[PDB]
Design a binder for these strands. Structure first.
Ligand SMILES: [Mg+2]
Ligand SMILES: [Mg+2]
Ligand SMILES: [Mg+2]
Ligand SMILES: [Mg+2]
Ligand SMILES: [Mg+2]
Ligand SMILES: [Mg+2]
Ligand SMILES: [Mg+2]
Ligand SMILES: [Mg+2]
Ligand SMILES: [Mg+2]
Ligand SMILES: [Mg+2]
Ligand SMILES: [Mg+2]
Ligand SMILES: [Mg+2]
Ligand SMILES: [Mg+2]
Ligand SMILES: [Mg+2]
Ligand SMILES: [Mg+2]
Ligand SMILES: [Mg+2]
Ligand SMILES: [Mg+2]
Ligand SMILES: [Mg+2]
Ligand SMILES: [Mg+2]
Ligand SMILES: [Mg+2]
Ligand SMILES: [Mg+2]
Ligand SMILES: [Mg+2]
Ligand SMILES: [Mg+2]
Ligand SMILES: [Mg+2]
Ligand SMILES: [Mg+2]
Ligand SMILES: [Mg+2]
Ligand SMILES: [Mg+2]
Ligand SMILES: [Zn+2]
Ligand SMILES: [Zn+2]
Lengths: 91, 149, 114, 69, 120
RNA sequence: AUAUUCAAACGAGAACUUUGAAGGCCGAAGUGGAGAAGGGUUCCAUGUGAACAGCAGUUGAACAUGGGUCAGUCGGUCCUGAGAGAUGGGCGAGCGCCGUUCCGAAGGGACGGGCGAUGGCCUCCGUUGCCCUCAGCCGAUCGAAAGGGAGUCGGGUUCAGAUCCCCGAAUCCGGAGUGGCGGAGAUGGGCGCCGCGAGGCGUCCAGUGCGGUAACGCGACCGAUCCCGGAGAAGCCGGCGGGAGCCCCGGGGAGAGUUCUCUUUUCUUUGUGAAGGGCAGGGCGCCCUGGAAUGGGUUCGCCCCGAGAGAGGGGCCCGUGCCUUGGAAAGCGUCGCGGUUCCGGCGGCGUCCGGUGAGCUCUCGCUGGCCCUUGAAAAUCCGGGGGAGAGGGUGUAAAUCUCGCGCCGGGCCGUACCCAUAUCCGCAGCAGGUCUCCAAGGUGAACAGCCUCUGGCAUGUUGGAACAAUGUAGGUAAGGGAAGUCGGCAAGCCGGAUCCGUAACUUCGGGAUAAGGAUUGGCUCUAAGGGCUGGCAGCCGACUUAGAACUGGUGCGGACCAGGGGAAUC
């Protein structure tokens, strides 16, 4: 049964810290406690160890990513830009 | 402890004697254990590698920039920060870079710099909700937290 | 019941002050100071999380008393690296050498052609 | 201590120079020959009194033997 | 005195509403109750599966149902298993006779065709 | 901070000493048994009763005589941590200070070869001075009796000491010319002969170990500088599982208590060390076959799988549990003899069989969750990669060995007692303060309160006789019910659990035990909730829930424990 209407993961925070703050931290909590897919083995076992450190439970392979997500849009756009610049330099 | 960005432990082999030299880097985004990273003047330009700013094309995103040659990295080394190569001056051997604070600085093109952006971006996004979290944050840094007006 | 006391001048429940109850032939319950549990060696590959097999799990200074047969296993890198990573290392070495030969012969053929 | 499960090896241990004495404990269903050497105590246990007596006559002559109870 | 009072309590006396100070969960935890029930039911399911009363597909289905809490007791689960087996047996018997009829008429038509081809 | 009484003994003298009996308290988070810091002889025996112990004392932590602390295996000793601190250097009128790798020529070591001298049957080796060759330390040194750190347990023994003395079982480290011995290396094959043959004779060749497809195993099983790795080496919390100690249940013994009546009754007791060997029991992210959707396996939860699930067959780690050597000789309980004695004296008999549990404590293991928190270093030990080298020419084998047994040694310092309403600090025998270890029965959710067993004590620096006022700490009061007071201050009401019921407002989480109702005792039953063996039969059980009848002067969370509530403002 649906236990709560609005509050989800931040239901553990009770009636404290303010509605806006709890709403803002809810998405980050979900993203950082979600399990991702290992782009090396394909199993959905990519967990967060600490801030910026992501580890796969099966490969035992660790990847340096983002604080609250596995990868950041800044990182992916920098990777694309770097690839394009390499291609430009080598023509 | 005390630093938001993670660190990478990279193993090289001494070119002058039978040994293996272990070094600790500032981890850039997308680097994984077991990856190969190449350091030098003629290492290809891709995420992770370190090479002098005088050889990368302008518009390159750079982390752990080296402020003076030989200094071994001083600039743009906090979580989520980076620097950008702006323009080259082939004579006088200088290049212009944009620091994460927005200032534009001129450096010698003979100094190394990691390619990419420091891992652990968006750490400031999550609000510390309680004095407990703030206390645990500053306990690993220094005695400065409970500021009295 | 017969509630009992320490037998040394250390009275704090620290890591070294660990005991277990035993019944003596004199029909008394005493403490008996246990030794710390040892750990088997980790594989030198650095990826496998398991401990090695065939090696006794004892404290580091106990290994002086033990014999080499009980300390290691009969294989290359025996008692220092798991068999999985040993065979992976063998295959990797052979395949890298084979591709090095291929690259050398192709490079020499291109040089001869030019 | 150690347990000796055979006769002739126990006899060799008895002929060993370091053997200081032998003791014979004659309990029920067992007869125990305990040879005191430099490091270990060697006990041979048998379940036949006639083996016990023949072994007692076949014990070394210069060994200090004492029966106890 | 303690033993006599314990015997009376085992018979059930002295244990009414008045002589209760802790909550029902404090007296007999629901987690322990659920644990015991799940162990009992899963053990029964395994014994049936290796006794070949039920097939693995039905075993998995009603294993998930047990976890989903539809069978309160060992007896209730057992009667559900009996009813399921009865319905399955009836459906299997009907299917067998239907396919026997189909195969019979198929081979009879094939026989007509082959004897026609032999006649020509 | 609940509490004393009777009799006897010693003694000149007894409310207080001692012994016996009775009544009580602490109540296993103790008024119990042991330590750390601190004290320093307060510990033990005898003697005294001048002084002290706020009465007294035949008593003492007082006074005087004498005694008492035994270690390779308890700890310091060693390592480094936060940190402290020399040399170089810099500064400073100067005593000196900064500084801890920074402006230093910071190594006094060695695999090995040669040179020259020496002793031992100058064999071969050892002690040697030089040359050749090889070689990084994060910086001397200090820094933990709770961190890291190999190795001792059982019984007995005093008046006061016991992992220290005695007896018996072990164990770690270090040493060894001739290696003390055994075993391993390692003793085979080919060929040519004699010999009926077995075997022997004589030449050539190999021999730094073997088994299993595999995980891996076997008693060893050569090897330097160098390099790689491991252990040491680690957070907090939750769930579950195994194993021990304790508690509980059914019997069988031995000894006690009750026996006006009953009770095959109630109570006490009913061992096996370390260190080896084997086996149950746990765990495996270890191996082989094989290839899975109609997906399967599986946990309390999770989770796992073509990067190989289910199904079989194997390997490894722990093993504190059982048996066994230790071991019944010892210990303990009972009955009975000797020494009148001075007794590790002697004797019999026994030390048995089972079942259980969301039980409590300890420990091992699996698994998860939280971190913008990621939860020591070094001494020390070990394995692996490499092949510089060494060993013998077939024998009387050699170099060598982390295998079995054997021989020798382990120096220095602490070690008594108190540990706290009387050995510590507060001027004191001060209701204050001071870091920990173990923890029975009942009730009960419970380490709550209340009563009890083991252990301890004598009411807290005095006793006797009365029961005035005023006090301090407790209670109860008709009728009214805050009228008292600055003010419901103080006291009082409610209280547990089960079944119903629950508003305004709101950050939708709460409010909430909202508020408001009913029940609860004792006894006799009924139903439901499981394991083992071979939709059924038998056998074992352990605690809960719901319902019903009966019954008491309507009494039942009967003591203890135990929320007054609502409407508002700042
Ligand atoms: Mg502060
Ligand atoms: Mg035992
Ligand atoms: Mg081995
Ligand atoms: Mg009391
Ligand atoms: Mg004491
Ligand atoms: Mg005490
Ligand atoms: Mg005294
Ligand atoms: Mg006086
Ligand atoms: Mg000794
Ligand atoms: Mg030191
Ligand atoms: Mg100084
Ligand atoms: Mg220490
Ligand atoms: Mg210590
Ligand atoms: Mg499988
Ligand atoms: Mg006996
Ligand atoms: Mg080697
Ligand atoms: Mg003492
Ligand atoms: Mg006092
Ligand atoms: Mg009093
Ligand atoms: Mg008194
Ligand atoms: Mg009144
Ligand atoms: Mg009234
Ligand atoms: Mg008035
Ligand atoms: Mg008024
Ligand atoms: Mg009040
Ligand atoms: Mg309210
Ligand atoms: Mg207003
Ligand atoms: Zn992966
Ligand atoms: Zn591995």
């Amino acid at each position: 049964a649906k236990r709560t209407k609005k509050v989800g993961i931040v239901g553990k925070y009770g009636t404290r810290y303010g509605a806006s703050l709890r709403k803002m931290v809810k998405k980050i909590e979900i993203s950082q406690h979600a399990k991702y897919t290992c782009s090396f083995c394909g199993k959905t076992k990519m967990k967060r160890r600490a801030v910026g450190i992501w580890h796969c439970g099966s490969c035992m392979k660790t990847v340096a990513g983002g604080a609250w997500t596995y990868n950041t849009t800044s990182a992916v756009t920098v990777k694309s830009a770097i690839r394009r610049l390499k291609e430009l330099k080598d023509q | 402890p005390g630093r938001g960005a993670p660190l990478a432990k990279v193993v090289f082999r001494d070119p002058y004697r039978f040994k293996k030299r272990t070094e600790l880097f500032i981890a850039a985004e997308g680097i994984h254990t077991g990856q190969f990273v190449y350091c030098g003047k003629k290492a290809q330009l891709n995420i992770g590698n370190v090479l002098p700013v005088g050889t990368m094309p302008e518009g390159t995103i750079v982390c752990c920039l080296e402020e003076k040659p030989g200094d071994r990295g001083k600039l743009a080394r906090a979580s989520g920060n980076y620097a950008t190569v702006i323009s080259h001056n082939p004579e006088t051997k200088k290049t212009r870079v944009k620091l994460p604070s927005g200032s534009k600085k001129v450096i010698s093109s003979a100094n190394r710099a990691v390619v990419g952006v420091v891992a652990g971006g968006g750490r400031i996004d999550k609000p510390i909700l309680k004095a407990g979290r703030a206390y645990h944050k500053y306990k690993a840094k220094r005695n400065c937290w409970p500021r009295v007006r | 019941v017969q509630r009992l006391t320490y037998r040394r001048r250390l009275s704090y429940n620290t890591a070294s002050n660990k005991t277990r109850l035993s019944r003596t032939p004199g029909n008394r319950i005493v403490y008996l100071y246990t030794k710390k549990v040892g750990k088997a060696p980790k594989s030198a590959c650095g990826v496998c999380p398991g401990r090695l097999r065939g090696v006794r799990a004892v404290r580091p200074k106990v290994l002086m008393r033990l014999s080499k047969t009980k300390k290691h296993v009969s294989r290359a890198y025996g008692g220092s690296m798991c068999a999985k990573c040993v065979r992976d290392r063998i295959k990797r070495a052979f395949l890298i050498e084979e591709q090095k030969i291929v690259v050398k012969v192709l490079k020499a053929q291109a040089q001869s052609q030019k | 201590p150690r347990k000796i499960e055979e006769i002739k090896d126990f006899l060799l241990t008895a002929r060993r120079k370091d053997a200081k004495s032998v003791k014979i404990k004659k309990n029920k269903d067992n007869v125990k020959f305990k040879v005191r050497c430099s490091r270990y105590l060697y006990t041979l246990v048998i379940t036949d009194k006639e083996k016990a007596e023949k072994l007692k006559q076949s014990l070394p002559p210069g060994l200090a033997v004492k029966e106890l109870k | 005195r303690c033993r006599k009072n314990t015997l009376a309590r085992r018979k059930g006396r002295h244990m009414g509403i008045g002589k209760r100070k802790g909550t029902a969960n404090a007296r007999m935890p629901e987690k322990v109750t659920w644990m015991r029930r799940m162990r009992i039911l899963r053990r029964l399911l395994r014994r049936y599966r290796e006794s070949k009363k039920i097939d693995r597909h039905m075993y998995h289905s009603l294993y998930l149902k047990v976890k989903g809490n539809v069978f309160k007791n060992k007896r209730i689960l057992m009667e559900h298993i009996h009813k399921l087996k009865a319905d399955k047996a009836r459906k299997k018997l009907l299917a067998d006779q239907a396919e026997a009829r189909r195969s019979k008429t198929k081979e009879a038509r094939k026989r007509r065709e082959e004897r026609l081809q032999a006649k020509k």
